[PDB]
Amino acid sequence: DSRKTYTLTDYLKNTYRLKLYSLRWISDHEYLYKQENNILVFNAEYGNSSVFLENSTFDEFGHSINDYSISPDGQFILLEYNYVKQWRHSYTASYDIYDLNKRQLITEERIPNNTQWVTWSPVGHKLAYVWNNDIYVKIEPNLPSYRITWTGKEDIIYNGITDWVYEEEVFSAYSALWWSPNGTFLAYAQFNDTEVPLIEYSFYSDESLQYPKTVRVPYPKAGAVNPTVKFFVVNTDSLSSVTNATSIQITAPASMLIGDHYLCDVTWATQERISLQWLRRIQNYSVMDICDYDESSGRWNCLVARQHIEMSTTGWVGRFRPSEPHFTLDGNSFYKIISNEEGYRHICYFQIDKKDCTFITKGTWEVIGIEALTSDYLYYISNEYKGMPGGRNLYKIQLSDYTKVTCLSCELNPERCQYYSVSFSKEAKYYQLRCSGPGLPLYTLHSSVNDKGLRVLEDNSALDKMLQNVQMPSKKLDFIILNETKFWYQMILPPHFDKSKKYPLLLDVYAGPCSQKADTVFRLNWATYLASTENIIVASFDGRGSGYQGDKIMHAINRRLGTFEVEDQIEAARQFSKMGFVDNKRIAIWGWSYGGYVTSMVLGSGSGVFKCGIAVAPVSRWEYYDSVYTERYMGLPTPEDNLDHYRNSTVMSRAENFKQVEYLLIHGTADDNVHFQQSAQISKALVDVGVDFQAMWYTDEDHGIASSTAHQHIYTHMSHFIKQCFSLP
Amino acid sequence: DSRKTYTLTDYLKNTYRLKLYSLRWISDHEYLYKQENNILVFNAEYGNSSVFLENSTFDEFGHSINDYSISPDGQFILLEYNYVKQWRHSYTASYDIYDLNKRQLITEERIPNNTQWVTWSPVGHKLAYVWNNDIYVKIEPNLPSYRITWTGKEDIIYNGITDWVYEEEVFSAYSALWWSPNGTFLAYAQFNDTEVPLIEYSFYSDESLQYPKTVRVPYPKAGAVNPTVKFFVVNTDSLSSVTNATSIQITAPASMLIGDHYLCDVTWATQERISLQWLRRIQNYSVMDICDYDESSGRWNCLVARQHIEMSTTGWVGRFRPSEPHFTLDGNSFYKIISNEEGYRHICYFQIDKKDCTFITKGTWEVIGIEALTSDYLYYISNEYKGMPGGRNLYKIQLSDYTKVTCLSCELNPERCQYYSVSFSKEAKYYQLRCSGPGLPLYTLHSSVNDKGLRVLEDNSALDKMLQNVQMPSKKLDFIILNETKFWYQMILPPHFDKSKKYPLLLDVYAGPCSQKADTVFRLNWATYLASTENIIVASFDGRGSGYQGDKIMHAINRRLGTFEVEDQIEAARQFSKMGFVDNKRIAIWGWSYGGYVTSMVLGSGSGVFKCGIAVAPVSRWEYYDSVYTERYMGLPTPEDNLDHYRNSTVMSRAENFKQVEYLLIHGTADDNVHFQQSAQISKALVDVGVDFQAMWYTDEDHGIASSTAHQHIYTHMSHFIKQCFSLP
Numbered sequence A, B: 001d002s003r004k005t006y007t008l009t010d011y012l013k014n015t016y017r018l019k020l021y022s023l024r025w026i027s028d029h030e031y032l033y034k035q036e037n038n039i040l041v042f043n044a045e046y047g048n049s050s051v052f053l054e055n056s057t058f059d060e061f062g063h064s065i066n067d068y069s070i071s072p073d074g075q076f077i078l079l080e081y082n083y084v085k086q087w088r089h090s091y092t093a094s095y096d097i098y099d100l101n102k103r104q105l106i107t108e109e110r111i112p113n114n115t116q117w118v119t120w121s122p123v124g125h126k127l128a129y130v131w132n133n134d135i136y137v138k139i140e141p142n143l144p145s146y147r148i149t150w151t152g153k154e155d156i157i158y159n160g161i162t163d164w165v166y167e168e169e170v171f172s173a174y175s176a177l178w179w180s181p182n183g184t185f186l187a188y189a190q191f192n193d194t195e196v197p198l199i200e201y202s203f204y205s206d207e208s209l210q211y212p213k214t215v216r217v218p219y220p221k222a223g224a225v226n227p228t229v230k231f232f233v234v235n236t237d238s239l240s241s242v243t244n245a246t247s248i249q250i251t252a253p254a255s256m257l258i259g260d261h262y263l264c265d266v267t268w269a270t271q272e273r274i275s276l277q278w279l280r281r282i283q284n285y286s287v288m289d290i291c292d293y294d295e296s297s298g299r300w301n302c303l304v305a306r307q308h309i310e311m312s313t314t315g316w317v318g319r320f321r322p323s324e325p326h327f328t329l330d331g332n333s334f335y336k337i338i339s340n341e342e343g344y345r346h347i348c349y350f351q352i353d354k355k356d357c358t359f360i361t362k363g364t365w366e367v368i369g370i371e372a373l374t375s376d377y378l379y380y381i382s383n384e385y386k387g388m389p390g391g392r393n394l395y396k397i398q399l400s401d402y403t404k405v406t407c408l409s410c411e412l413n414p415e416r417c418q419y420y421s422v423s424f425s426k427e428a429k430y431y432q433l434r435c436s437g438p439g440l441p442l443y444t445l446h447s448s449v450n451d452k453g454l455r456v457l458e459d460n461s462a463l464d465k466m467l468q469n470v471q472m473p474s475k476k477l478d479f480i481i482l483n484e485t486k487f488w489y490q491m492i493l494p495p496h497f498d499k500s501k502k503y504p505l506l507l508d509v510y511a512g513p514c515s516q517k518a519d520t521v522f523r524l525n526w527a528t529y530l531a532s533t534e535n536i537i538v539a540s541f542d543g544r545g546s547g548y549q550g551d552k553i554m555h556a557i558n559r560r561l562g563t564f565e566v567e568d569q570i571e572a573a574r575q576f577s578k579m580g581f582v583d584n585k586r587i588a589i590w591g592w593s594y595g596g597y598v599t600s601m602v603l604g605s606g607s608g609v610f611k612c613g614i615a616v617a618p619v620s621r622w623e624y625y626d627s628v629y630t631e632r633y634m635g636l637p638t639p640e641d642n643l644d645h646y647r648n649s650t651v652m653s654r655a656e657n658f659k660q661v662e663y664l665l666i667h668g669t670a671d672d673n674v675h676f677q678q679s680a681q682i683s684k685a686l687v688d689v690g691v692d693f694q695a696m697w698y699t700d701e702d703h704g705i706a707s708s709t710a711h712q713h714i715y716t717h718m719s720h721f722i723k724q725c726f727s728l729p
């Protein structure tokens, strides 16, 4: 073979680019798609298009447009510019509204600058936005706003938006407002961070900044004071009739009010029925209320006969939180993924006023998500196919006959496609399938009426051609047996892989609770280069604590982070040695985030298995990480709860053992998530026992170390480190 | 040669210690010397001693005693404990006073905890101390203290102590209190930092600290708002229990009050005469006031006819600040080191009420300091001897006949001893000479009347014996000529140095204004180990900007930091690389603090001379460093003054040029002096141009990186880096 390899520069410079097909459904029949900067509208049934918005229309706008969104009625477009990222989901921007009829910009009563969130109503063209921590509503795009809240206060009171921990850990979103289905009501949460302690760290900014700024963020670490929450619903139809429309509070159940709790789900069921899920700070007890608008009293009442309890004896509730309900049209019943009697997550069907649900799926595999629901069918994604927990397929279950389950994606191309997600049109008339591996991504359109393939949207044939002329690595996905249990692993294997030879191995680690690092996804990444160019086998293993394989495995680390998931990585590397193609003198380990923690714990174990390793932005001590995530698995760091294990599971306590390995420690100085503190404490502990190691800080980079320059820099630095570690002198 | 070399562990574990002889003169005849925790009193004439304080007298004290301070009359001893370090000189402590005649601790009216500064009066046993930024006086150690100031406010108003910049850059002391010679009056300064911006940075503390704390220090960077100053004198003999003490203000001269200024010297001339020097923020103009107490008015009057102006056309005033005056017994005249018409610093004799002074010394060499003054002789240290700038000897000049200058140390032992300092007894009847190289330190005692060498106090005989068992490096001190100017260098040369072999060379740099890195001092340091064990030549060079050779050289970098001192290091290395015994493929550079700046500027020069280098806590951009030091050399960073050169002299602008060198960048995260910011901006600039480098932060270490464990870790890591840089294929 004399083809070039996939090199570091190929990775860093995006030589071989995966083609996507990102569409946005605007109705049951049409979607928007961007072609040469034009936004086209496509007819799903026939595949024909027209130009929805010419790439030239905003040449003289005066700013770069970061994103857009069309009002559901297609009458207006929201233009987003001046994008300034905040945390993982949050950002601020400027907004203009463009009238698609008059084909003109709206110049009056503009959405203000530094707006924190904006959303169209689900029908028509009402807008709700949050600015300086208060909610505002515009019935019409050109008319004055109605103020909804007056309590907003920077870093203290948040109306309609989440604080740091709710954004990161509870909602995975910045917005905390929820329009009712036809847009009459606006529901929202209000967060109060008054007594939440602040994390503080320096931000250096451009070199022109003479004094560094101190960034200050309300952030509860494990066992600290949490934000408190309240929930309100306002009738937006009353706004133009009343001076100051009342926000009606819906209070949490008595079973939540006894202690610290969270609001963890808000889902509208009908025009006049809302469901809310609450979670106790000890995250093994959750309560769903189902609340009806009382038209005579103007209030929202939650009948206790409609209250649903969800609890767990072996772990926490949900994968990362209680699952969302999917209501039938009439709002009298719902489906929900919950853990069955054998510990497998399956769809349960509830009547809103009956406490026992009926499971509609079962087996030793799990439902991943419910994707659409029509009067006749529920569509869901699972890992059932071929008993492969790292595969994903779309299924269709007949609501009038649960024995009728059709796999819609399994057989479409079984060699190329074992991992699917899906995007349904507005009332599920059409669906886009996204195949993401093990072959090249493939995007296809389908009609729900007959489940017929309409067309291939994107097959990545250009890329397939380019890759022919490259010595690509291959991927092996398989399992090993420990204590009568299957544990899955993957290997990125060098091209021309020869089982008779001995290769250096890099164990690529995440291993957090419900993680999955062994799967059928096609990836072009650093491991691609390491296998292709450096002849390194890059392996990953899903041990105890990993997800999508039932609660027995997932909850094995309950209250005991930093134990089995760490040991099982070491055991995996031993098993890979036994396999006879691994150079036992050249086994390395690396990971980012939770993976940095595990890497560090492994390097500090004294196992003798690993020559060297790299931790990027690691957790080092559970008391340093946020409350919601940490306590879910660890409970509270108090003498009476779990303090002893909090104190027993730190990186720092294993400092002496790092004498036996080569360690590289890396962290961004402006990481708001895993604070630089965490690595600062590892380095100090290594200094204190006289261990030499390598270190790199990334000025002003956060948890993603994702700026273009820092990304290239970190992977270049890590490559040098691995090459040196593995070099035969 | 089977002798051991001087190893890294030898340096790190202090295997070979220099013996000292630290004495404290208590009168014209006697000194105190700490010996095995016992404090002995010695008679200078005979060399006999008695015990003044047994090592066991405080066996039952309950605390480890940091330090001792015996009152001038020998009646009391101040006991210092609970020492908590603050900045370079500042710290807080607790104090008890032990009555030497009652043989008991004083338990009534104790000095409070967290006392910031304490000092005995110069005669007797009064005390002045600062606590919570206010001054208190105790007339007797068991009596209630009088409160002198009431305006003390943390981080804002400082009475009798310095703020950060005055401590670091003006006074080199935390103390801002000055007793009159017999203790009648107590003069003090008051600093007001109201509008001085704060540097803020994180401190991580022990692992147990859940949230890092933010340190906030009022610290004026270049061009920022400076602290303001006021000066006061209080009569301590007329204090009342009933009414508040009255402090008399002495205001600065009009030529100072017109703009920003500093108080830079306070020196009592007589019991009733005090001199003050003030310096403009533009530090090329200073003025001395000489002020007399008016018994009639109780006021202090500074006659204009007694005002002395000192300015510079080529640079700033004084070496690091205007020099201190040395008054005669009657206070009617004084001697002061000032730059003469050739730019050489010599002793000038002033009459208090005449503008012209008379130079009493002259020549192409410099007086370093005035050490003692009697009616017949002034005693000073200079580098006159053998025309060697890096040598120091003690001289005396006959005040009746300036042609009569006698060297008192030059010929004592010219081979061993070329660098002296001196300590005189109260009326200059005796002196202790401290020889510090080129041979082993030698401490001797002398009587002034006929300059007899009375006795050897400490000759390091023991260490000499040990060192003969070790392959010690030698030192060459010599010069090169640049533009017909002599510039001095030193080389630490490996044992068995062979001029025909080729050695790698490490250039050890400081190169700050008035620095001197080429001298005759004997050192046991990191360089000793590099030469002795690793066979590396360690060179240092004193180029333009360096000290003790006149203003032509010293002021060559005026308004132009990061130019000629940087170029001259490159030029010296260039010249060294053309010597037969130097391997031009293995020349490295390193420096700390100002030396780290210069190392970085050199590595970023694109000279091609250096393979690698290490910068420890470097300055990177002059706008980040403090006002008093920076502006002394650079003026103000405004377009009207010197901003263009502030902007041209940064490390960050040279980032691209690092592509051809190996660089190690190191910095303590709690550096209050050269902020971590400075290195954070270097790393970000290197990342931005895609340059790979090595880095190390030191959690919670300051500018000295001097904790036992951090000191060992840094030197270990640097040694690995150099060894790797110098390893041959």
Ligand SMILES: O=C([C@@H]1C[C@H](N2CCN(c3cc(C(F)(F)F)nc4ccccc34)CC2)CN1)N1CCSC1
Pocket (backbone or CB within 6 Å): A168, A169, A172, A320, A321, A512, A593, A594, A619, A625, A629, A673, A674
């Ligand atoms: O940053 C963090 C944590 C992780 C935590 N993540 C964990 C992964 N997580 C989730 C991942 C995925 C996947 F993958 F299926 F799509 N799906 C989710 C679906 C619903 C909710 C959460 C999901 C989203 C939130 C947020 N902060 N650290 C935790 C310890 S080390 C640093």
Ligand SMILES: O=C([C@@H]1C[C@H](N2CCN(c3cc(C(F)(F)F)nc4ccccc34)CC2)CN1)N1CCSC1
Pocket (backbone or CB within 6 Å): B168, B169, B172, B320, B321, B593, B594, B619, B625, B629, B673, B674
């Ligand atoms: O830390 C600093 C600066 C240096 C500055 N130093 C410079 C050296 N300096 C001085 C050194 C010496 C020597 F030599 F005779 F002993 N003697 C002095 C006699 C009187 C006053 C100052 C002196 C004491 C003050 C304090 N902060 N940086 C400057 C730029 S990089 C970091």
Ligand SMILES: *[C@@H]1O[C@H](CO)[C@@H](O[C@@H]2O[C@H](CO)[C@@H](O)[C@H](O)[C@H]2NC(C)=O)[C@H](O)[C@H]1NC(C)=O
Pocket (backbone or CB within 6 Å): A149, A150, A151, A244
């Ligand atoms: C809309 O009604 C709210 C609710 O009463 C008003 O907010 C209150 O204002 C008073 C006085 O300023 C405060 O003491 C209360 O604490 C506020 N309550 C809340 C929930 O914010 C608000 O001012 C009204 N807006 C207008 C324009 O009248």
Ligand SMILES: *[C@@H]1O[C@H](CO)[C@@H](O[C@@H]2O[C@H](CO)[C@@H](O)[C@H](O)[C@H]2NC(C)=O)[C@H](O)[C@H]1NC(C)=O
Pocket (backbone or CB within 6 Å): A182, A183, A184, A235, A237, A271, A272
């Ligand atoms: C959206 O749903 C809301 C809530 O049901 C509707 O508002 C109600 O409309 C009915 C008319 O059939 C009235 O009986 C009630 O007085 C209304 N209730 C409230 C709270 O306003 C609303 O009409 C629906 N909107 C649209 C556009 O269909």
Ligand SMILES: *[C@@H]1O[C@H](CO)[C@@H](O[C@@H]2O[C@H](CO)[C@@H](O)[C@H](O)[C@H]2NC(C)=O)[C@H](O)[C@H]1NC(C)=O
Pocket (backbone or CB within 6 Å): B151, B157, B192, B193, B194, B195
């Ligand atoms: C320390 O300095 C500040 C000025 O920096 C003084 O505060 C000023 O005092 C004047 C007169 O009383 C006021 O009119 C100003 O408003 C103050 N200025 C600022 C910026 O606050 C303060 O009095 C000084 N303190 C002492 C003890 O001298």
Ligand SMILES: *[C@@H]1O[C@H](CO)[C@@H](O[C@@H]2O[C@H](CO)[C@@H](O)[C@H](O)[C@H]2NC(C)=O)[C@H](O)[C@H]1NC(C)=O
Pocket (backbone or CB within 6 Å): B182, B183, B184, B237, B271, B272, B295
């Ligand atoms: C220290 O010197 C001061 C200042 O000269 C002395 O105080 C003066 O002493 C004279 C002579 O007795 C008095 O007449 C003056 O009125 C005093 N002046 C002031 C301002 O107090 C003081 O006595 C001396 N102290 C010692 C211990 O010698």
Ligand SMILES: *[C@@H]1O[C@H](CO)[C@@H](O[C@@H]2O[C@H](CO)[C@@H](O)[C@H](O)[C@H]2NC(C)=O)[C@H](O)[C@H]1NC(C)=O
Pocket (backbone or CB within 6 Å): B282, B284, B285, B311, B312, B313, B314, B635, B640, B641, B642
């Ligand atoms: C102190 O230094 C400043 C700055 O170099 C000198 O001010 C300069 O003086 C002349 C005019 O007399 C011009 O070259 C510049 O316009 C001035 N520069 C600035 C920045 O103002 C000043 O003369 C020096 N003082 C002394 C006594 O030498």
Ligand SMILES: *[C@@H]1O[C@H](CO)[C@@H](O)[C@H](O)[C@H]1NC(C)=O
Pocket (backbone or CB within 6 Å): A041, A042, A043, A046, A048, A049, A050
């Ligand atoms: C697609 O084709 C049909 C004609 O058969 C037409 O009615 C429809 O408007 C077209 N859609 C677009 C988006 O061009």
Ligand SMILES: *[C@@H]1O[C@H](CO)[C@@H](O)[C@H](O)[C@H]1NC(C)=O
Pocket (backbone or CB within 6 Å): A036, A037, A038, A055, A056
């Ligand atoms: C705009 O659209 C046309 C295709 O109709 C294309 O030629 C052009 O590249 C697009 N982008 C521009 C002009 O920036």
Ligand SMILES: *[C@@H]1O[C@H](CO)[C@@H](O)[C@H](O)[C@H]1NC(C)=O
Pocket (backbone or CB within 6 Å): A151, A157, A192, A193, A194, A195
């Ligand atoms: C937020 O909580 C604090 C209690 O710590 C309370 O004083 C304050 O009024 C609350 N503000 C609200 C709910 O707007």
Ligand SMILES: *[C@@H]1O[C@H](CO)[C@@H](O)[C@H](O)[C@H]1NC(C)=O
Pocket (backbone or CB within 6 Å): A282, A284, A311, A312, A313, A314, A635
């Ligand atoms: C929730 O967790 C705590 C700690 O494990 C436990 O004491 C409590 O009983 C748990 N609840 C359930 C339902 O198991």
Ligand SMILES: *[C@@H]1O[C@H](CO)[C@@H](O)[C@H](O)[C@H]1NC(C)=O
Pocket (backbone or CB within 6 Å): B030, B041, B042, B043, B046, B048, B049, B050
């Ligand atoms: C030293 O000896 C003399 C007598 O020769 C005596 O007066 C003096 O006190 C002694 N000094 C000390 C400090 O022991």
Ligand SMILES: *[C@@H]1O[C@H](CO)[C@@H](O)[C@H](O)[C@H]1NC(C)=O
Pocket (backbone or CB within 6 Å): B094, B110, B111, B112, B113
């Ligand atoms: C200093 O602290 C100790 C311990 O708290 C206390 O007992 C003592 O009285 C304090 N000293 C003074 C002078 O206040």
Ligand SMILES: *[C@@H]1O[C@H](CO)[C@@H](O)[C@H](O)[C@H]1NC(C)=O
Pocket (backbone or CB within 6 Å): B150, B242, B243, B244
């Ligand atoms: C002295 O001055 C301070 C404030 O300036 C005052 O509080 C105190 O009472 C005064 N004491 C006397 C005795 O006048």
